Amino acid sequence: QTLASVSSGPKHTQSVPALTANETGATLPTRPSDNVETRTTYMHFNGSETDVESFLGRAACVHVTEIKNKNAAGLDNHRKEGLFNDWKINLSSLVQLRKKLELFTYVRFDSEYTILATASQPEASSYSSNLTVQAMYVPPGAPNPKEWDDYTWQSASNPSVFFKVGETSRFSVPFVGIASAYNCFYDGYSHDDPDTPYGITVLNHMGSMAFRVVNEHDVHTTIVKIRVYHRAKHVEAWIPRAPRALPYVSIGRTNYPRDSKTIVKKRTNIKTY
Amino acid sequence: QTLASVSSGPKHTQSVPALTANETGATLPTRPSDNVETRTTYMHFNGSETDVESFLG
Amino acid sequence: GYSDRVQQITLGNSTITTQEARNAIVCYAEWPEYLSDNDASDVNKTSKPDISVCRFYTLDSKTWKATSKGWCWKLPDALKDMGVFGQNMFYHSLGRTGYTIHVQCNATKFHSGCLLVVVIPEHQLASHEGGTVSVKYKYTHPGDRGIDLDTVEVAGGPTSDAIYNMDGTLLGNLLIFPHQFINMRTNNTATIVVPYINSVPIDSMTRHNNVSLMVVPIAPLNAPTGSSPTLPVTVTIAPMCTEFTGIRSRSIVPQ
Amino acid sequence: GYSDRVQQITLGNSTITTQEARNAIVCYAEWPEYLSDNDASDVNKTSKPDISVCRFYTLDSKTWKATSKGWCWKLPDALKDMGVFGQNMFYHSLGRTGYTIHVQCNATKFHSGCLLVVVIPEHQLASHEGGTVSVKYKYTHPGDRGIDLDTVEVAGGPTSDAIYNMDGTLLGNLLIFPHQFINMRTNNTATIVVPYINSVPIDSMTRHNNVSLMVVPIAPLNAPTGSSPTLPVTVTIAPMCTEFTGIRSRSIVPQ
Amino acid sequence: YTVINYYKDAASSSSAGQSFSMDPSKFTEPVKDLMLKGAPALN
Amino acid sequence: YTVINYYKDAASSSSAGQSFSMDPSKFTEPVKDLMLKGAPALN
Amino acid sequence: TNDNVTNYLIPLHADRQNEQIFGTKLYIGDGVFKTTLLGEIAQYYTHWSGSLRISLMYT
Amino acid sequence: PDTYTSAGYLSCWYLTSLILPPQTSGQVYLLSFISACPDFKLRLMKDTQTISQTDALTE
Ligand SMILES: [Ca+2]
């Protein structure tokens, strides 16, 4: 038992806790017993669910993509045809999690990736194909796939997972930052150039993931949609910031819509209840 | 903690580690403190991922 | 006999005094200190010019008008032409420092107005255009002048929205960052001690600003009848525990 | 196994090497050291930039022709545009330092010639005109270029007399000053370590040169038949134990 | 309850426990001179 | 962390640990007479 | 245009003064270092850190 | 090669100049070597760009 409130009686002192000076920049821990006669009560509470481990410890969808399985004969752009796809791992494309991460400035953690692959056959097909997807972790510098069945899929040194459509794949990934933490924000540039981008840093690089169906082609086309979920484990977060108020518009940019002008709800009278 | 670099100051010696003879076929382990004033830093690293077990594992 | 209101800060060959202070904030309860061996990566020896760079430099004054929106300075950018500090800042590949920021605004027991003086680590600005457009280097590198929020916006520059903190967040929540107020009826000044905050031990002082000091009028300035409708705002800043490394030829930056 | 001939000097982020040395001279048998409290007058704190200024700076090369008379450099003048050293040299009212002077001249076992490399404390130059005419400031402040003794004399400049040491004394007696020779058949280089020598603890680095490095061909350069009739002469210099004080705005000098 | 790690890498393990070392002060009272609730904020 | 072998054959087991007995010398200084950094490579 | 033993030879000229002998960026995974043993093995990894050794042998 | 993570430049110049003896002429060459110091570290293993193929090989 920790006390939520203590028994407190009347006052008539020179010690006035009700008065302070917010000019100082401080917020003194006043308690109701500083301005009211109180009774003893117990916290009966530890605050587990608000620990940052908790707060960022659940899987959230961070990306949805699509691939296909057709007959690649005569097709000159496998990527455009949808025979394989990429994903430049980033956690700011889907907004639900992005607002959570951004509550802090620097963030360090391990990742638990769960990949779901569901299939659909939108047009006339005799049966539903049982496909196998390959997910390849392509670190910057490794050769990029160009065709759905390149030498690249050999993946001799790049980690890859093979799993069935309808199933799910799960693996953990260590904190892969080149610095001591990930930058939720970065008020800088890659080099002092007049035209180089701002904010986006390799200091947030987590990689690129490549996807494909390992099977050949049937008579029909099968559409595979991939959903990537991320869960943060072994979390560390520094420097809390102001919540995001305006809509997001772009990945890795604090840019906000210019026609968004009413985030705060309005009344008519400051006196109404 | 293993040291990545030690603190090292100015020099004026007869001991010249900057000069060698590659004709011998050897590569002597010179360190930046042989040609620059350095500060102490730690490896903070063991080299697990480069073990051949890893490399071909 | 001593007060929380009268204070003296002596740093190098400069001494500042205030008789109307409201304590002072030491960001995240941490005082500046040099880089330790445990935290160090770069094998090079760091240069510590001391008292030649760790002294108070006073920025060009601002004018608080009754319609003023606010001002923004980016560090270490704002001090890049300040004596031996600026020099060192452009001869080394890397540097590290903390500061003592002293914001000044005196008035009259007849005036009323309130300034919010805040230090924001990693203040990534939003662009005038929005979309995927970035804020051009020169716009986040104004030097001593800083960013005057009631200036007309240009293509590729930041927004001029104090209400949105120029980043898509709301003004009222700016209180989560180390801040202090300058309430004329009370205050005269605001002092904030800033330690080095970064995800890397040392960094490039030109391609990255670690913080941006923001002075924002919240309560409009209201001068007495017949008094001058404006008040100047002065910002004095002193680098503390400065270290430099990767010395070479002068860094070449855009402009 | 070690030799008096092969040597390495590491100062900051610069390392020099020689395989054909002839020991080295430590002026008046004294190694540089900082200013002590017992000797100090000025109450101010001294700035010690260390490894950022105490590193080797290489001056623009000279060309030893068979008719060459000699060259003269004045310190700290010759290093006034050298990185962070020059900067510090013009922001402080006073400074103090010692140096490591390294003069280089390699050749061929077929060449013959001899250079006298000497350091002269307080080398007060004589004027071209004589009489009561003084040598104009700009002529004793040539910077990196130094004074080339086989250049035509101008009004208000120094004499170009190597035989008279430019001061009314004879060349042969220049050996009373810390010196070293560069005898091709033997030598390759000359190294001289110079402590701070002055009648005042600290001084102004711009209105007073404490020493002047002089490189004077004594034995004419004689190259082998069919060989190039010239050889370059390079001078590398490193300030050691540098201290600065009286920091302020940038010193304003003539030109 | 019981848990034994089945994998070699530390990343593989499940969630870390509750920090129990909360301290709102770095954020709520980062003042240089200590202020005591009840005494004059400014003297 | 824990591991018990479920199979009889040694081949069945997982990866061997880190060697921790690195020695670049056999490759970097296979010289007969010892050379000391700082002393004349050839005398 | 073609690989040849002369790629390993840095030319030096007599009686040249103040001149530049060579220049290169420090991209160990690219440029001149890409084919070397260090650059060759560095390219099997994503990150690198450490000090480098450059020796110049006079012939 | 990434801009934020660049390592700087490397260059060579004559401090004096090369001097050849009588009865000697032409160019002289320098051999340069690269290796890592004990300082070195490499992480995050991946596939190289220094080898590929269009078809599987056969005997
Ligand atoms: Ca069927």
> How far is the C-alpha of D99 from the C-alpha of D146, rounded, in Å?
17
* C90, two tokens: 């452009």
> How far is the C-alpha of C127 from the C-alpha of C142, rounded, in Å?
15
Nearest Cα residue to D18 out of D26, D27, D28, D9: D9
> How far is the C-alpha of H10 from the C-alpha of D244, rounded, in Å?
32
Q: Do H40 and G53 touch (CB under 8 A)?
A: no
C101 and C192 Cβ atoms separated by less than 8 Å: yes
> How far is the C-alpha of D152 from the C-alpha of B28, rounded, in Å?
53
Those of residues 1-59 in G touching chain D at CB distance below 8 A are 14-15, 17-18
CB atoms near residue A225 (< 10 Å): 14
**CA-based diameter of chain C, in Å?**
63
Q: Does C32 touch chain E (CB under 8 A)?
A: no
**CA-based diameter of chain D, in Å?**
63
Q: Do B51 and F37 touch (CB under 8 A)?
A: no
Counting CB pairs under 8 A, whether chains H and B reach 3 or more, is yes
> How far is the C-alpha of D9 from the C-alpha of D25, rounded, in Å?
14
Q: Do G45 and B49 touch (CB under 8 A)?
A: yes
Q: Do A179 and C209 touch (CB under 8 A)?
A: no
> How far is the C-alpha of C40 from the C-alpha of A56, rounded, in Å?
30
Enter the DSSP assignment of A23: G
Q: Does H19 touch chain D (CB under 8 A)?
A: yes
Which residues lie closer than 8 Å to D99 by C-beta, 6 or more apart?
Answer: D32, D75, D193, D194, D237, D238, D239, D240
Beta strands in A104-221 (DSSP E): 104-120, 132-138, 160-164, 168-173, 182-183, 208-213
Q: Does C48 touch chain A (CB under 8 A)?
A: no
Q: Phi and psi for C29 in degrees, rounded to 5?
A: 60, 25
> How far is the C-alpha of C139 from the C-alpha of H17, rounded, in Å?
47
Which residue reads 């004990």 in tokens? H38
SS3 state of residue A106: strand
A51 and E18 Cβ atoms separated by less than 8 Å: yes
Which residue reads 């009323």 in tokens? C112
By Cβ distance, the residue of C47, C83, C91 closest to D91 is: C83
Nearest Cα residue to C13 out of C57, C49, C59, C51: C51
CA atoms within 13 A on the CB side of D150: 12
G51 to chain B, minimum CA–CA distance in Å? 7
Nearest Cα residue to C91 out of C58, C143, C47: C47
D191 and D8 Cβ atoms separated by less than 8 Å: no
Task: State how many domains chain C has.
Answer: 1
Residues of D in contact with F39 (CB under 8 A): 1-2
D65 and D229 Cβ atoms separated by less than 8 Å: yes
> How far is the C-alpha of A78 from the C-alpha of C30, rounded, in Å?
55
Going from the Cα of A125 to the center of ligand 1, the distance in angstroms, rounded, reads 9
Residue D110: exposure state from Cβ atoms within 10 A (0-12, 13-18, ≥19)? middle
Q: Does A241 touch chain C (CB under 8 A)?
A: yes
Residue A161: exposure state from Cβ atoms within 10 A (0-12, 13-18, ≥19)? middle
Q: CA triplet C54, C79, C71: central angle to 5 degrees?
A: 125
* A189, two tokens: 């540039």
Residues of B in contact with F22 (CB under 8 A): 47
CB atoms near residue C91 (< 10 Å): 20
- Residue D250 lies in domain: 1-255
* D118, two tokens: 């000497």
Which residue reads 């900057």 in tokens? B18
What CA–CA distances, in Å, run from A69 to A63, A78, A125, A217, A220?
Answer: 20, 10, 13, 6, 9
Give the β-pairing of C25-26 and C189-194.
parallel
Nearest Cα residue to C20 out of C183, C214, C194, C215: C183
Q: Does D232 touch chain G (CB under 8 A)?
A: yes
CB atoms near residue D87 (< 10 Å): 25
What CA–CA distances, in Å, run from H23 to A106, A141, D106, D226, G13?
Answer: 67, 51, 18, 9, 16
Residues of D in contact with H17 (CB under 8 A): 231-232
Nearest Cα residue to C144 out of C100, C80, C86: C80
CB atoms near residue A44 (< 10 Å): 8
Give the β-pairing of A132-138 and A60-69.
unpaired
Sign of the torsion angle spanned by Cα atoms D90, D92, D94, D99: negative
Q: Do E27 and C5 touch (CB under 8 A)?
A: no
Nearest Cα residue to A82 out of A220, A209, A221: A221
Which residues lie closer than 8 Å to E32 by C-beta, 6 or more apart?
Answer: C23, C24, C25, C26, C193
By Cβ distance, the residue of H39, H44, H45 closest to B5 is: H39
By Cβ distance, the residue of H15, H16, H21 closest to D108 is: H21
> How far is the C-alpha of D133 from the C-alpha of A139, rounded, in Å?
75
Radius of gyration over every alpha carbon of chain C, rounded to an integer in angstroms: 19
CA dihedral of residues D128, D134, D137, D141 (deg, nearest 10): 50
> How far is the C-alpha of D178 from the C-alpha of D194, rounded, in Å?
9
- Nearest chain D residue (CA) to C11: D45
F23 to chain E, minimum CA–CA distance in Å? 25
> How far is the C-alpha of G44 from the C-alpha of H6, rounded, in Å?
18
The 3-class secondary structure across chain C, one letter per residue, is CCCCCCEEEEECCEEEEECCCCCCEEHHHCCCCCCCCCCCCCCECCECCHHHCCCCEECCCEEECCCCCCEEEEECHHHCCCHHHHHHHCCEEEEEEEEEEEEECCCCCCCEEEEEEEEEECCCCCECCCCCCCCCHHHHCCHHHCEECCCCCCCCCECCCCCCCCCCECHHHHHHCCEEEEECCCCCEEEEEECCCCCCCCECCCCECCEEEEEEEEEEEECCCCCCCCEEEEEEEEEEEEEEEEECCCCCCCC
Nearest Cα residue to C121 out of D98, A272, D32, A104: A104
Q: Do A141 and G46 touch (CB under 8 A)?
A: yes
Q: Does D2 touch chain B (CB under 8 A)?
A: yes
> How far is the C-alpha of D7 from the C-alpha of B11, rounded, in Å?
10
- Distant-in-sequence contacts of D28-34, Cβ < 8 A, 24+ apart: D28/D178, D28/D195, D28/D197, D30/D195, D31/D193, D31/D195, D32/D97, D32/D98, D32/D99, D32/D193, D32/D194, D32/D195, D32/D196, D32/D240, D32/D241, D33/D195, D33/D241, D34/D96, D34/D241, D34/D243
* D92, two tokens: 């402080």
Q: Do E41 and A25 touch (CB under 8 A)?
A: no
Residues of F in contact with E5 (CB under 8 A): 1-2
Which residues on neighbouring strands pair with residue A172, listed in sequence order? A112
Q: Does D61 touch chain G (CB under 8 A)?
A: yes
Counting CB pairs under 8 A, whether chains C and A reach 3 or more, is yes
> How far is the C-alpha of A112 from the C-alpha of A114, rounded, in Å?
7
Nearest Cα residue to A191 out of D153, C138, C253: C253
Q: Do B30 and H41 touch (CB under 8 A)?
A: no
A236 to chain C, minimum CA–CA distance in Å? 12
Resolution as reported, in Å: 3.0
Nearest Cα residue to C220 out of C177, C174, C183, C178: C183
String of DSSP letters for D59-105: PPPEEE-TT---EEEEETGGGTTSHHHHHHHTTEEEEEEEEEEEEE-
Host H or E run for residue A97: helix A95-101
A98 and A132 Cβ atoms separated by less than 8 Å: no
Counting CB pairs under 8 A, whether chains C and D reach 3 or more, is yes
Q: Do D6 and F43 touch (CB under 8 A)?
A: no
> How far is the C-alpha of D32 from the C-alpha of D75, rounded, in Å?
15
Q: Does H25 touch chain D (CB under 8 A)?
A: no
B40 to chain G, minimum CA–CA distance in Å? 14
A56 and A24 Cβ atoms separated by less than 8 Å: no
Nearest Cα residue to C140 out of A199, D33, A47: A199
> How far is the C-alpha of F19 from the C-alpha of F21, rounded, in Å?
5
> How far is the C-alpha of D24 from the C-alpha of A34, rounded, in Å?
79
By Cβ distance, the residue of A138, A139, A201 closest to H4 is: A201
Which residue reads 């920790």 in tokens? A2
> How far is the C-alpha of B17 from the C-alpha of B34, rounded, in Å?
6
Going from the Cα of A165 to the center of ligand 1, the distance in angstroms, rounded, reads 19
> How far is the C-alpha of A249 from the C-alpha of C128, rounded, in Å?
13
Q: Does H1 touch chain D (CB under 8 A)?
A: no
Provide the residue type at H20 as one letter.
Answer: L
Cis peptide leading into residue C178 (ω within 30°): no
String of DSSP letters for E1-43: ------SSSGGGS----------THHHH--BSS---TTS-S--
* D133, two tokens: 């005419």
Residues of D in contact with G17 (CB under 8 A): 61, 63, 232
Going from the Cα of A218 to the center of ligand 1, the distance in angstroms, rounded, reads 14
> How far is the C-alpha of A137 from the C-alpha of A154, rounded, in Å?
12
> How far is the C-alpha of A228 from the C-alpha of A242, rounded, in Å?
28
Q: Do H41 and B47 touch (CB under 8 A)?
A: yes
> How far is the C-alpha of D4 from the C-alpha of B13, rounded, in Å?
10
Going from the Cα of H38 to the center of ligand 1, the distance in angstroms, rounded, reads 64
Nearest Cα residue to A177 out of A106, A239, A233, A113: A106
- Distant-in-sequence contacts of D135-144, Cβ < 8 A, 24+ apart: D137/D254, D138/D254, D138/D255, D140/D74, D140/D77, D140/D209, D141/D74, D141/D77, D141/D209, D141/D253, D141/D254, D142/D74, D142/D77, D143/D77, D143/D78, D143/D80, D143/D81, D144/D59, D144/D60, D144/D78, D144/D79, D144/D81
Q: Do C43 and B42 touch (CB under 8 A)?
A: no
Q: Do H13 and G17 touch (CB under 8 A)?
A: no
Residues of H in contact with B29 (CB under 8 A): 37-38
H30 to chain B, minimum CA–CA distance in Å? 12
Nearest Cα residue to D66 out of D224, D191, D234: D224
Buried b (16+ CB within 10 A) or exposed e, C170-199: bbeebbbbbbbbbbbebbbbbbbbbbbbbb
Nearest Cα residue to C46 out of B32, F30, D49: D49
Which residues on neighbouring strands pair with residue A109, listed in sequence order? none
Write the CATH number for D231.
Answer: 2.60.120.20
- Nearest chain F residue (CA) to D5: F40
Residues of H in contact with D224 (CB under 8 A): 21-22
Those of residues 37-66 in D touching chain H at CB distance below 8 A are 58, 61
* A87, two tokens: 């994903």
Q: Which CATH class is domain F1-43?
A: few secondary structures
Count of residues for chain H? 59
Sign of the torsion angle spanned by Cα atoms A70, A72, A73, A78: positive
* Protein residues with C-beta less than 5 angstroms from the ion ligand 1: A 127
C182 and C115 Cβ atoms separated by less than 8 Å: yes
Nearest Cα residue to C162 out of C103, C220, C94: C220
Counting CB pairs under 8 A, whether chains H and G reach 3 or more, is yes
Sign of the torsion angle spanned by Cα atoms D80, D85, D90, D93: negative
A183 and A89 Cβ atoms separated by less than 8 Å: no
Residues of G in contact with D63 (CB under 8 A): 17
Residues of C in contact with B32 (CB under 8 A): 43
- Nearest chain H residue (CA) to D229: H19
Enter the DSSP assignment of B24: G
CATH architecture of A1-273: Sandwich (2.60)
Going from the Cα of A126 to the center of ligand 1, the distance in angstroms, rounded, reads 5
Nearest Cα residue to H46 out of B51, G52, A204, A160: A160
What CA–CA distances, in Å, run from D152 to C154, D69, D115, D216, D218?
Answer: 58, 12, 22, 17, 20
Residue A152: exposure state from Cβ atoms within 10 A (0-12, 13-18, ≥19)? buried
By Cβ distance, the residue of A141, A157, A178 closest to G29 is: A141
> How far is the C-alpha of C25 from the C-alpha of H19, rounded, in Å?
66
